[PDB]
Structures are given as C-alpha cells and as structure tokens.
RNA sequence: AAUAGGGUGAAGCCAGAGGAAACUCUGGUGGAGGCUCGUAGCGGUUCUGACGUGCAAAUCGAUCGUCGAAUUUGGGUAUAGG
RNA sequence: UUGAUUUUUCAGGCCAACCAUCGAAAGGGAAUCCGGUUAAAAUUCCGGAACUUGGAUAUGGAUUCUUCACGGCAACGUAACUGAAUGUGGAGACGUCGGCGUGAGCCCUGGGAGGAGUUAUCUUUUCUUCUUAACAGCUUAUCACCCUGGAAUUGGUUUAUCCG
RNA sequence: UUUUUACUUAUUCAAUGAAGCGGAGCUGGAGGUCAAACUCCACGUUCUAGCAUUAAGCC
C-alpha cells in the first residue's frame, strides 16, 4: 500500500502550524530572585486576541531589576483582568486574580491557571479558555502540592511551581455551534492543515487500512493495539472500552 | 440611613453635582462635605481628598457607584462626586 | 412592528442548519452582541472585541471576559472563592 | 520628518511630540499625589516603629 | 519659484552675488472693474529659486527697473 | 490583485395604538445572510449538436451550474517516486 | 564615540540581549515636473522650472550680561531657539462589507470670442478650441482638543441612536 | 546473590544575557526565659496605567 495520512504529518511539510499572526508564546516570567524571595509588580498594557487561541493574551510590562529596561511579558489573560491593572508575581504576592504565586503559597481550593509542571518551565497546565487547576492539598514535609487538572487527573507538583490566580478568559466558546463548514475553515485557517477530514473507510486499500470493499465498512476491529506500528494505528488506539459511555467512569 | 440624610439635603439644602463643581467649591471654601462614589477613579479620588485635606473638609465615601449616587440625589443621570454647600433641614454633616 | 416571531437575530440564517441549532445559536449570539455596563465608569458601553475581550468605548478599559458574556458564572464563583480564601490567610 | 524643522515635529511642553496634553496632565498629577502618599506612609510607619 | 511682495526686499535680493539674470515681463491685463492696465513682472534667477515681483503700477515698474543693479543682464519679454 | 445591476429584507433604532401587569399590535428606519435573480469571472449539464486524417493529441456552438465567498487568480515558497 | 597626537604614538568612554548571508522589477522604500524634439529614444535628450541624499562651508538672521528664545489661562504658536550614554514611544504598519459626505477627472449645460457643417423649407442652429504640471507661499476641515458655564419641562443630534 | 533506600562525580532533562546558590553572621518579632541567651519566623517594594539609568553621603 501507500503511506497513510497519519504518517505524512510527522514530516511536517504542509502540516506545520500557521504562526504568522500569532502574538508570541504565552509564558510566565523567568523565575528570578524577585519572584523567589519577594514579589515584582507589573502593569497590564494590552489584552489582545491571539489567532489560533481561544484565550486572550495579556501584555504586562515589568521593570528589569538589574538594568534600566522595560520587560514585556505575554501572559494568558485570566477572566477579570483589565488594562492598567497591577500584576504581582512572587513568593510574597497576594492572593488576587491575575497574581502569580508559588503553589505552596495558595490555600486549598484556590483556582489557578497556567500552572508549572516543573519549577521554572513557565506554565504547562490549564492554559485554554475556561480551564483552570484546583489545588487539592499540600505536603509541606516533601514540599509537594496536589492539584486537579481540567481532565480530572490528580497531579503532585513541587510547591515552588507557579500559577496564575483565576480562570482562563474566553470560556464558554464551545457552547455555540459552528453551523457551517466555512466556520471550521476559518477556524483552522490560522491553526494548521487538519481540516477537512476524509474518512478512511471512504478511501482505497492503498490509502488506509479501512479502505476498499463493495460496501464502506472497516472489516476488522477498529480498536488497535498500543504495540501496533505506524500505518496500522488508524481507529481507536489502545481503547480500554468502546460504545456509548453509560454511567460514571 | 445616610441615603435618607443625603436625600433631605438635596431637597432642602445646597449642593453641587460633578467633579468640576466640587473642585471649585473646595477652592472657594464653600464645601461642607464631599461625597465620592465607589467606582470613581482612584487618581481623581486621591486628588479630591487632597483638595479636601488642604481645604479642611470631611470626605464621605458613598458605597454605591455613580449610577446609585445619581439616583439618591433624585437625578436621572450619573453623579461621580458631589459637595454639600449647605446642609439644610438634614443633619448629614453631624453624621457623615 | 415585530418582524420575526421567534428566530430574532438568527433570522439571518434562513431555513438552514436545523431549528435546534439556530435556537442554540440565538441564546449565545444575543449575549455576545449586547451592551454591558462598565464596572469602571458606570456607562453601558461595553462590547465584545474578539472572544474573551470586552472593551468600553467611553473609558477605553479592556477587561478579559467570557467568549459570549463579559463574565461567566464560573469566574464569578472563583472571584468570591478567591476573596474568601484571601480573608482567612490575611485574617 | 528628517527634512522638516523642529517646530513641525514637536509641541512646547513636556513629552511634547510624544504624549498628548491630557496624558501629560495625568502623569504630573499622578506623580505628585503618589509621591505625597509615599511620605504619609513613611511617617505613619515611623509612628508604629516607636509605640508598638 | 517664490513670489516676492515687498519691493524693498526685491531690490536687496537682486544684488545678491549669485543672481545670474533678470526677466522683465509685460502682461496686458484688465481688472474687469475698469479698463486695460499694464502689469509688469520682475523675475530674478537665483541659484535655487526664481523670484518674481508683480508690479501692477505702470509707473512704479519703470522706477523699479532703473533701480536694479546695472550689471544684471535683463531680458525684456 | 479581481468580483455590473436588481430582489428579499435579520438584529438594532424611531413613532403611533392597546393593556392593571406580564406584555401585544401597526407604520417606518436599518441593511444581515457560506440568501437569491443575474453580468464579468470560475465551472462544464445536455444536445449523447458540430468536428471527429479537427481550428484543436479535448476545440467550437447553443444550453446550462455558480457568481461576495469552503470565491477567483498572478508571483514567491515548501512537499519528490513505494 | 570623543578629545586627539602630529609625540603618525594615543588616552580612554561606552556598550556587544539580537545581529553570516540569500529571499519581492505586485509587499516596505530618499528625491521631477511641464512644453518641445526622432525614421526609430525619452518622467532619460533639448528648454525651463524643482527636489532629495551625502559632503564642505561662509554670510545674514537668531541666542547669551537672568547664559542654552519668547508668546498664549489653555488647546498650542513661531524663522531659529545646547543636549552624550541609556531608555520610552510614534511613523513604516496593514481584513472585509454597507450606506452617507467631500473632492478630482469625466458626463451634461448657459453667455461670449473664433473655426467648420446644413440651409428647397426649418433650425439665435449641429460639431468643435477656450488649457494650466511638479514645486513655493498664504489661506482652507470632518474628527479631536481647550477655555467659559452648569443642564429634567432632559437637551443636542445622524440616512443609519448615540452623546452629556 | 536478591530487595529497599542514602551519596554525587559518571550519565540524563531544563533554564539563563550563567544575578544573587549553600552555610554563617548582623537586626527586629516571638517561646518563659531558670544561665545565658538556645530554638523558630521575618529581615526596605500592594488605594492610583507616574518616576527609578551613567551613587550621593561618610571614613
Ligand atoms: Mg469530523
Ligand atoms: Mg469526513
Ligand atoms: Mg472510492
Ligand atoms: Mg492495507
Ligand atoms: Mg487491519
Ligand atoms: Mg474496507
Ligand atoms: Mg456508509
Ligand atoms: Mg508643532
Ligand atoms: Mg451585487
Ligand atoms: Mg462547451
Ligand atoms: Mg457528440
Ligand atoms: Mg466529417
Ligand atoms: Mg450563463
Ligand atoms: Mg501559487
Ligand atoms: Mg536581499
Ligand atoms: Mg522591490
Ligand atoms: Mg504590507
Ligand atoms: Mg515595490
Ligand atoms: Mg515630457
Ligand atoms: Mg516609443
Ligand atoms: Mg533636463
Ligand atoms: Mg544638503
Ligand atoms: Mg524669536
Ligand atoms: Mg472594522
Ligand atoms: Mg468604503
Ligand atoms: Mg512629485
Ligand atoms: Mg542562571
Ligand atoms: Zn467604561
């Protein structure tokens, strides 16, 4: 047969992300002396739309502690953050929406976003619109914090990892139907080349494991082993179960 | 309660509504009290209370916004700040 | 006069996409085109830019909000939750 | 702009050709009021550094 | 080309060291609120600009013409 | 970079009428839409027309689809034979 | 980058995040127009009139004895009218559609000064020339802003209901 | 020999214009002090869309 559409994406010729209009990478500040020992104050200059992103971004200006210079940061805007607001980041920052605090400095039940998986990676968890991270508890002896991720998973993170207080702005986006193929076209025009999708069952046997037949049908189980190889992993990969989800999981 | 006292002053006493009138009344020493709405910008607020400090005038911080401050005064518009020139039948100055 | 009995703003879609999808669109699309009261200046001049971006024409304050409303219910809950937990820590 | 006299490119005020009149006015008032409160917060702090 | 309005400025300009030549142009005009009058344009060619003085008075033109430097080449048009 | 001229008439807004209220009705205004008739354009339904040693190794004619967007298109650029 | 040194030596003062290079005759971008001219070239030649950039450089004006100018309440004005390192901003620099407004060119048209056509009859008639470049000065605008004043009997106001 | 967990220098991951790490000591706030000051915490920035650069001062 032929190389299937799954495998052509790794080469990344026409499958790279369309990034001309993007407004910068959304990251926290580099963890420095001020954030480790006290707090540093910045001011929100802009709240802007980032193409390909549901969450708006905030442009926050900080002073450089060591040279006469202004540093502009690109944060993910939490809902309620406004232009001209003062943003405080550090160990001694107060528990206000938009402030960046270490996870150990936040009491249980604190809603936090753009949380660091590892100390200083500048934000990994809960970055999309309407999403957040809940702080479950602390383990001060081991310097660890328990959090709940938007997927429902419980994670143990260093208490020195940082997060931004509040919920990511732009939530409720999925509640409205797109209603049109053109709307999805414009949605993916600034994301990547993944739309529209032809069904593999509608192809020929060269194109896909599902192609061929005198009727459109998969022919074999569409649940594929985790240990299958590239060109085989088309369908439900390592599916623990199938069918309509009934009851609680 | 202060809303009732303030309403009486508007009915019987003397007052100015608006930032420009309030600052003029502080310059002339004709202000007995300055009332500032809750959503007034802090820079304008911190300047009105600097004028009152120089003018030796008490300041009352209204708990509602300029929409609620306007309707207490019987107005169909917004009042960000006001000054009481003459508390008349009311006793708002003795309570603040 | 009243021009449409029930479609309202979704009358631009004609007969397409299904009635259930159009009435689901109508609820959130009335909200995203509404004018909201500014919490800063007090005027009803707040309108949406892109999703999550709500600007006031008068005082030129931009606030981060929801996709189709200035504030979502989840954000309002977090505001009070953060406010409550802040009081205990600071006594 | 390189080939025109300076009066065309500026206004005789602080931040003349850079900021508008109202934004300069707000900077001046903000600078004065905030620095005045900095003194107040200092003398008050010294009031609590000798009795408490 | 720049126009000169002050007659005193024009004579001081015509004796600048870079002035090559001069042009005296006679235009037969009419003000439409009267009858024909003879307009005279004195044109001085400097390095960068040609300077023109319009003299609507037929007598002030003759006095001005003899007030120019004698060294200038004058073309009568 | 390009895309005549019409039809329909969505929100929003103005006025009038009715009602105790919750609200309803009428006349305008407005100018929405992967709306519509229809040029340029893009396409290529039917005649199973012409032609079928052609004007043409795919064209010609009439008829037709669509025609403000998932539109059409120049140039630059990327992807290379299991 | 300076003060230099004529001692053709130097003394230093700042910085070195990023930054090889290539990539557009439709993107960005310093500056030119008119008239004429050839068998065949012209925003290129000729005539005239400008402009930009780089460099050199004197005179006038301006400024200083209150050393680095004055005026205006203000928006701001002007012939000028110190300003290193470093920093902050602006311009470059930005989709699409709808109606409205203004301008320009074109179309239409009156008088007058010319030329041509029709004219058995009719036609104060039909056609045509009557133009003004870049550039310089003065003046000229929606929007925006300033001063005054203190508004419900709410007023102003767009084709489109927004503003206080 | 097998299981577990201690070390860091091999090896691996990440960041930064390699800027403040580790330990100790100055200063306060505390424990109730039963020798004698040991232990713990902190140790210049939070009404505001301003400013912070090329050290003043003392010896
Ligand atoms: Mg699908
Ligand atoms: Mg499909
Ligand atoms: Mg097939
Ligand atoms: Mg196969
Ligand atoms: Mg198979
Ligand atoms: Mg099959
Ligand atoms: Mg099927
Ligand atoms: Mg100027
Ligand atoms: Mg059309
Ligand atoms: Mg055909
Ligand atoms: Mg045939
Ligand atoms: Mg034949
Ligand atoms: Mg057709
Ligand atoms: Mg192409
Ligand atoms: Mg190049
Ligand atoms: Mg080019
Ligand atoms: Mg461009
Ligand atoms: Mg070009
Ligand atoms: Mg020419
Ligand atoms: Mg030619
Ligand atoms: Mg020439
Ligand atoms: Mg020059
Ligand atoms: Mg002067
Ligand atoms: Mg627009
Ligand atoms: Mg337009
Ligand atoms: Mg030109
Ligand atoms: Mg480092
Ligand atoms: Zn506002």
Which 3-state string (H, E, C) describes A34-56? Answer: HHHHCEEEEEEEEEECCCCCCCC
Tokens 């008075």 locate to E57
Token digits for A50?
């980032």
β-bridge mates for residue C47, sequence order: C55
The answer to whether the CB atoms of C71 and A79 lie below 8 A apart is yes
Q: What chains are in contact with B, requiring at least 3 Cβ pairs below 8 Å?
A: C, D
Give the separation between CA A241 and CA A130, rounded to whole angstroms.
29
3-class SS at B15? strand
Helices (H), A88-179: none
CA distances for C14 relative to A186, C1, C5, angstroms = 21, 20, 14
- Resolution of this model in Å is 2.3
A4 φ, ψ (degrees, to nearest 5) = -85, 165
Q: What chains are in contact with D, requiring at least 3 Cβ pairs below 8 Å?
A: B
- Contact of D23 with chain B, judged by CB distance below 8 Å, is answered with no
- In sequence order, the 6+-apart residues with CB closer than 8 A to the CB of C19 are none
Give the separation between CA B43 and CA D30, rounded to whole angstroms.
7
Q: Which nucleotides of G are covered by protein (CB under 7 A)?
A: 48-53, 69-72, 74-82, 86-90, 134-137, 145-146, 149-152, 154, 162-164
CB-CB contact of E74 with E64 (8 Å): no
CB-CB contact of B15 with B82 (8 Å): yes
- In sequence order, the 6+-apart residues with CB closer than 8 A to the CB of C64 are A47, A56, A58, A77, A78, A79, A80, A81, A82, A169, A170, C52, C53, C54
CA distances for A174 relative to A127, B26, E13, angstroms = 15, 54, 78
CA distances for E13 relative to A232, C1, E48, E75, angstroms = 93, 78, 13, 18
Q: After which residues is chain C broken (C to N over 2.5 A)?
A: none
D20 φ, ψ (degrees, to nearest 5) = -80, 170
CA distances for B36 relative to A84, B9, B22, B47, angstroms = 21, 16, 10, 11
Give the separation between CA E42 and CA A189, rounded to whole angstroms.
68
| A114 C-beta neighbours (distance < 10 Å), count | 26
Residue B23 zone, left/alpha/beta (φ > 0; ψ -120 to 50; rest):
alpha
Give the separation between CA A83 and CA C62, rounded to whole angstroms.
5
- Rounded to 5°, angle at Cα A166 from A163 and A172: 120
Give the separation between CA B40 and CA B78, rounded to whole angstroms.
11
Give the separation between CA E74 and CA E24, rounded to whole angstroms.
7
Tokens 């936090």 locate to A112
The answer to whether the CB atoms of D30 and B43 lie below 8 A apart is yes
Sign, CA dihedral A127-A130-A131-A133, equals positive
CB-CB contact of C49 with C40 (8 Å): no
Give the separation between CA A57 and CA A76, rounded to whole angstroms.
5
CB-CB contact of A242 with A224 (8 Å): no
Give the separation between CA E49 and CA E51, rounded to whole angstroms.
6
Token digits for A25?
């990478």
For B17-49, give one letter per residue: b (16+ CB within 10 A) or e: bebebbbebbeeebbbbbbbbebbeeebbbbbb
β-bridge mates for residue A156, sequence order: A146
Token digits for B78?
């917004």
User: How far away, in angstroms, is A239 Cα from ligand 6 center?
Assistant: 20
- Please indicate if the annotation marks C59 as binding a ligand: yes
Which residues in range 26-65 of chain C are in contact with strand F, contact meaning CB within 7 A of any of its atoms? 33
Give the separation between CA E59 and CA E51, rounded to whole angstroms.
21
Token digits for C48?
């949406």
Helices (H), chain C: 19-32, 73-90
Tokens 């708990």 locate to B63
Token digits for A219?
């022919």
- Please indicate if the annotation marks C41 as binding a ligand: yes
Exposed / middle / buried, residue B87 (Cβ in 10 Å: 0-12, 13-18, 19+):
buried
Which residues in range 52-91 of chain A are in contact with strand G, contact meaning CB within 7 A of any of its atoms? 61, 68-70
Method by which this entry was solved: cryo-EM
E52 φ, ψ (degrees, to nearest 5) = -115, 130
Give the separation between CA A27 and CA A35, rounded to whole angstroms.
15
């Amino acid at each position: 047969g032929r190389v299937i559409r799954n495998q052509r994406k790794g080469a990344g010729s026409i499958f790279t992300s369309h990034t001309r209009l993007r407004k910068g990478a959304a990251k926290l500040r580099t963890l420095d002396y001020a954030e480790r020992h006290g707090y540093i104050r910045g001011v929100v200059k802009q709240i802007i739309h980032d193409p390909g992103r549901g969450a708006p971004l905030a442009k926050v200006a900080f002073r450089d502690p060591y040279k006469y210079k202004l540093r502009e940061e690109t944060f993910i805007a939490n809902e309620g953050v406004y232009t001209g607001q003062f943003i405080y980041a550090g160990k001694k920052a107060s528990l206000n929406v938009g402030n960046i605090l270490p996870l150990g400095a936040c009491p249980e039940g604190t809603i936090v976003s753009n949380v660091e998986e590892k100390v200083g990676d500048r934000g990994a968890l809960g970055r999309t619109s309407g999403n957040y991270v809940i702080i479950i508890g602390h383990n001060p002896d081991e310097n660890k914090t328990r959090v709940k991720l938007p997927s429902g998973a419980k994670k143990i993170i260093s208490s020195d990892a940082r997060g931004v207080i509040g919920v990511v702005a732009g939530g409720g986006r999925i509640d409205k139907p797109l209603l049109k193929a053109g709307r999805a076209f414009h949605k993916y025009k600034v994301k990547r080349n993944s739309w529209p999708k032809t069904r593999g069952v509608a192809m020929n046997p060269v194109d896909h494991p599902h192609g061929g037949g005198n009727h459109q049908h998969i022919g074999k189980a569409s649940t594929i082993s985790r240990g299958a190889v590239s060109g085989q992993k088309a369908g439900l990969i390592a599916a623990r179960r199938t069918g309509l989800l009934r009851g609680t999981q | 309660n202060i809303n009732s006292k303030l309403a009486l002053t508007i009915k019987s006493g003397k007052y100015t509504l608006g930032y420009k009138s309030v600052v003029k009344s502080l310059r002339t020493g004709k202000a007995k009290l300055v009332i500032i709405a809750a959503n007034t910008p802090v820079l304008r607020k911190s300047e009105l209370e600097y004028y009152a400090m120089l003018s030796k005038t008490p300041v009352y911080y209204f708990q509602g916004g300029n929409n609620e401050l306007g309707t207490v005064c019987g107005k169909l518009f917004r009042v960000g700040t006001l000054s009481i020139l003459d508390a008349g039948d009311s006793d708002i100055l003795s309570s603040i | 006069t009243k021009r449409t009995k029930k479609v309202g703003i979704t009358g631009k879609f004609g007969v397409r996409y299904g009635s259930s999808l159009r009435r689901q669109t109508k609820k959130l699309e009335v909200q995203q085109h509404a004018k909201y009261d500014c919490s800063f200046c007090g005027k009803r001049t707040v309108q949406r830019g892109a999703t999550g971006i709500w600007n006031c024409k008068s005082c030129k304050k931009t606030v981060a909000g929801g996709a189709y409303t200035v504030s979502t219910a989840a954000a309002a809950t977090v505001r009070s939750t953060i406010r409550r937990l802040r009081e205990l820590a600071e006594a | 702009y390189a080939q025109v006299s300076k009066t065309h490119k500026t206004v005789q005020r602080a931040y003349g050709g850079s900021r508008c009149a109202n934004c300069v006015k707000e900077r001046i008032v903000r600078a004065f009021l905030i620095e005045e409160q900095k003194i107040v917060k200092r003398v008050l702090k010294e009031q609590q550094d000798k009795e408490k | 080309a720049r126009e000169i309005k002050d007659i005193k400025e024009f004579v001081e300009l015509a004796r600048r060291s870079d002035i090559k030549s001069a042009i005296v142009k006679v235009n037969a005009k009419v003000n439409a609120n009267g009858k024909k009058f003879k307009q005279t344009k004195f044109k001085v060619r400097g390095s960068r600009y040609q300077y023109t003085l319009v003299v609507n008075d037929a007598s002030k033109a003759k006095k001005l013409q003899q007030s120019l430097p004698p060294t200038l080449k004058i073309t009568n048009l």
